[PDB]
Amino acid sequence: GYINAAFRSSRNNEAYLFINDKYVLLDYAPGTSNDKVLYGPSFVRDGYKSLAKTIFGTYGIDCSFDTEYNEAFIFYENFCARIDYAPHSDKDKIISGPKKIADMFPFFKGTVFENGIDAAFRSTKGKEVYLFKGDKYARIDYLTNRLVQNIKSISDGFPCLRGTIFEAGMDSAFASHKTNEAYLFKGEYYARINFTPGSTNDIMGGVKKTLDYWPSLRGIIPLE
């Protein structure tokens, strides 16, 4: 029971992470030690009234990403929705959906993302987002609804991961507030990386034990 999804929050240095059918709001504190928990672990169906009677309230969120303002896409197997998470309040709501990924993102039909996406994170460039499934990755634009490029292996677009455990998949991910940095997770490990849109680059060395560098997650992952 490790992190299966996360998205960056509009609120500075805050991020929501999803574990099983639960979630936690966190001040991850990118370049600082005061990495702390703000809310939860709490059940999605409890923290999000808009999802109480949904498949998401029942099983949780398995992949997601922030878009713009207080909104994020959340997934659960072949289904997804756009929600306004209403940071630090009662007022969350489902904006679009829930629909199938195939119906929310027509370009995914026939590809390996059709029935589920492993993880994702927002790019700093325009309205672009990167999504992962297996050892493949997608770069999309959510406003104009298209694949910016052909889907290809994670190593092709993210060479710094070749050799690492992320080569073959990501349980979860979210973008950092610090420019062009993202956080990736798989099992007990994570990695902070610096990416550059339209380019194939390293780097950020140090795949690390997540609990080793996230004081605030002890007692929370692994959730059993």
SS3 content of the chain, % helix, strand, coil (to 5): 15, 40, 45
Letters for 119-138 (x = contact with Na ion by CB under 5 A, - = none) are x-------------------
Instruction: Tell me: is residue 194 an annotated ligand-binding position.
Output: no
Tokens 């029935």 sit on residue:
115
Which C-beta is closer to Na ion: that of 142 or that of 202?
142
For position 21 contacting Na ion by CB under 5 A, the verdict is: no
Could you tell me the smallest distance in angstroms from the CB atom of residue 216 to Na ion? 20
User: Hey, CA dihedral for 54, 58, 64, 68, is it positive or negative?
Assistant: positive
Q: How far is CA 116 from the centre of its chain?
A: 13
For position 221 contacting Na ion by CB under 5 A, the verdict is: no
Both structure tokens of 28:
């991850």
Letters for 63-102 (x = contact with Na ion by CB under 5 A, - = none) are x---------------------------------------
Q: Total number of residues binding Na ion (CB under 5 A)?
A: 6
Instruction: Tell me: is residue 4 an annotated ligand-binding position.
Output: yes
Which C-beta is closer to Na ion: that of 132 or that of 142?
132
- Listed in order, strand segments (DSSP E) in 134-202 are 136-141, 146-147, 152-153, 172-175, 181-186, 189-194
Tokens 């060479």 sit on residue:
159
Instruction: Tell me: is residue 118 an annotated ligand-binding position.
Output: yes
Query: Can you give the binding site for Na ion, defined by CB under 5 A?
Result: 4, 62-63, 118-119, 172
